Write a protein that binds this ligand. Sequence first.
Ligand SMILES: NCCCCCCNC(=O)c1ccc2nc(-c3cc(Cl)cc(Cl)c3)oc2c1
Ligand SMILES: NCCCCCCNC(=O)c1ccc2nc(-c3cc(Cl)cc(Cl)c3)oc2c1
Lengths: 116, 115, 116, 115
Amino acid sequence: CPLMVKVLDAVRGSPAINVAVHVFRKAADDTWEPFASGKTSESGELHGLTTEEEFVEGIYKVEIDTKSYWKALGISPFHEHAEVVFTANDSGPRRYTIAALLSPYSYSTTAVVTNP
Amino acid sequence: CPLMVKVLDAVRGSPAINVAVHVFRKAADDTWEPFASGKTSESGELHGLTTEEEFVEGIYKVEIDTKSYWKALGISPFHEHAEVVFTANDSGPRRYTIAALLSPYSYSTTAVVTN
Amino acid sequence: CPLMVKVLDAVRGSPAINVAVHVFRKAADDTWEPFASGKTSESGELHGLTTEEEFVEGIYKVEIDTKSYWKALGISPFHEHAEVVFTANDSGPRRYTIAALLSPYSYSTTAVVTNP
Amino acid sequence: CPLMVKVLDAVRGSPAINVAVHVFRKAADDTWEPFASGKTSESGELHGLTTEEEFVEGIYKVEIDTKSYWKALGISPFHEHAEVVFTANDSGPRRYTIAALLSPYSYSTTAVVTN
Ligand SMILES: NCCCCCCNC(=O)c1ccc2nc(-c3cc(Cl)cc(Cl)c3)oc2c1
Ligand SMILES: NCCCCCCNC(=O)c1ccc2nc(-c3cc(Cl)cc(Cl)c3)oc2c1
């Protein structure tokens, strides 16, 4: 429950379905270690990536594979992916929704951070 | 000079050219009075809408005809237009750029207010 | 169920709570008639505005009172409100989520349109 | 000339000034090689990063240090930075403007690619 990703398509006005998402966590030696991955559902949501126990303090990167999404719709987009990089749980455990809104040459991302 | 509008296209990655823009000022009876209008340039910009003397404090509406733009590109849009409504304030900075970034089902707008 | 409004705050990373929302529908004489209104909940969502029977084809305007929201947080924002104007149900009944992401000098809006 | 970065501040309604920006090119071993960097100007712009000859096709990353910017304003930010990753392509248009609009918990970016 502590990390969820939601992806919307600004061209079609719909969830962005079947988008690949890779999460990484910065290690002590400053490299990016693979942490979790998955794909968005029919609702454009990806749940279940991690657990309260596993999701410790750290710097996390959420890489959303926007380029494969657009190419499967016949569009050659600008970006390789959308990356969202952030420190998590620095003030204690929180619940993070990482939302992204996609267009071929543009994206936006926002975080909704809540305290259970 | 005090008011400029800049419009970008998030699908094509380009200025949004030949977009109609109408500006209105709110009247004492709360109706919207036509004030200025134009079409964006090849750089997506619309300059020269008003003057320093004319652009007095008040509530203004900038209406961007996004629907006609998407229709021209053959892409089904959601909005009828994008409307940006704001109060012009003499105390702060003196130049207003109203920027808008367009997608068929989404738009964003920001104000860049400077001296 | 056919019209929902969801509002997020891009400064705090949270739902935008207690935001006033007024919906209007363009009448045959081309004026804006009041249609529904409400305020966002603790989750930043406003449900229950209308019904499948009432929400006929038409041009609708959703006016989100962003200026009162920012002022109560001590911020003097740029916009008077965010307005979202759109034709609804032109191809038959649909389910519309109107989402808005707010900052003091900027907002974005997107629509998620689904077919039940 | 072929690559420019423009950064805006959605809280203050202003250019985002003195923002550090680093550009990287992806190497054959998939590491990120430093390529160019600078700080945005009083207009929020960073010009002169590269040249027509140097800016060959490849995968580029533009990393905008948003966290330091919000720290300077005393506002708690979410992201460590904003990263924009793209392939540069000779067939299409020749000038790339990478624009970004910053809020403490959100950012948006668009590419304006023109001749
Ligand atoms: N009739 C019922 C139909 C319901 C469809 C699903 C409801 N959907 C949301 O409850 C929801 C949740 C987070 C969202 N985050 C954004 C967002 C993100 C960015 Cl980066 C920019 C912008 Cl403009 C919006 O929209 C959301 C919607
Ligand atoms: N005396 C000189 C008067 C100068 C007025 C300022 C002109 N200003 C622009 O030329 C400009 C350029 C790129 C922009 N990129 C955005 C942008 C990006 C995103 Cl991601 C979202 C949104 Cl809403 C906007 O706005 C721009 C404005």
